[PDB]
């Protein structure tokens, strides 16, 4: 019975954690968690993990 981080990464853009019995999302270095607390927004250009092209 797929829950929290196990269900579609818990809606997180990047790292998900089941903390208590709810999903806590977080982001690699060079990103900040958006206001919704799920999306990861780059704080600079040349964030990690992106092809230099879009």
């Amino acid at each position: 019975t797929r829950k929290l981080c196990s269900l579609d990464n818990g809606d997180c853009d990047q790292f998900c954690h089941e903390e208590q019995n709810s999903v806590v999302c977080s982001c690699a270095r060079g990103y900040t968690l958006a206001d919704n607390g799920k999306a990861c927004i780059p704080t600079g250009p040349y964030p990690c993990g992106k092809q230099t092209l879009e």
Partner: protein
């Protein structure tokens, strides 16, 4: 890389190339930040002294956008063993910082548990390199990428003449003629998630290149995240 496709403009920006005194590529690497390149420990025996090239796609010409950097510090894992290939991982601190731009940018480091639960359970990752184009061939002048399925741990110990440690993982194809190869070593294995690429492995070894019933063996990056962190300070 054997098979695979060219990295097109902007697609493999985390690739570094280690180059020897003759300015010839002998091993690959992954950009982690403006100062630090990840590679295989076994690559540091393939030349007396070396530099790091980034932003290169075609080693024959000079696109512009390419930069050599000199290494300031080599951190080789304390346990590396030439003989088992276990702990095949090293970090290089550059004397001067990498200037990110088109074709030059870091791959992200994942968190351990998330990486192992989500990234390594995807179907495929992407490995990339200037390495040889067949077992008996010459090194590639174009930078190449190849999508490689994760291989089940068991199968892959079953396939292997040598021990597969918990620091290693298998990826590639049983019979399809696609694989990393000599020269690709130390290079990136990255796994895409939504639209972000995370480092997951380091091209370490294989028995030949693209042999039937054999896979590519990668260093398991998730086993060394804390160590990579320490190394980077």
């Amino acid at each position: 890389i054997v098979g695979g496709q060219e990295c097109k403009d902007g697609e493999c920006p985390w690739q570094a190339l280690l180059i020897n005194e003759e300015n010839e590529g002998f091993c690959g690497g992954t950009i982690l930040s403006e100062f630090y390149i990840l590679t295989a420990a076994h690559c540091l025996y393939q030349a007396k002294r070396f530099k790091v090239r980034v932003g290169d796609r075609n080693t024959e010409q000079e696109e512009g956008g390419e930069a050599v950097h000199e290494v300031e510090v080599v951190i080789k894992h304390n346990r590396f063993t030439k003989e088992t290939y276990d702990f095949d991982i090293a970090v290089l601190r550059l004397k001067t910082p990498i200037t990110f731009r088109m074709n030059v940018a870091p791959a992200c480091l994942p968190e351990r548990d998330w990486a192992e639960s989500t990234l390594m359970t995807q179907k495929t990752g992407i490995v990339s390199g200037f390495g040889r184009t067949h077992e008996k061939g010459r090194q590639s002048t174009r930078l190449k990428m190849l999508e490689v399925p994760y291989v089940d741990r068991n199968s892959c110990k079953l396939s292997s003449s040598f021990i597969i440690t918990q620091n290693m993982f298998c990826a590639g194809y049983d019979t399809k003629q696609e694989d990393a190869c000599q020269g690709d070593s130390g290079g990136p294995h990255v796994t895409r998630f939504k639209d972000t690429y995370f480092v997951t492995g380091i091209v370490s070894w294989g028995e030949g290149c693209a042999r039937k019933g054999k896979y590519g063996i990668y260093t398991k990056v998730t086993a060394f995240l804390k160590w990579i962190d320490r190394s980077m300070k």
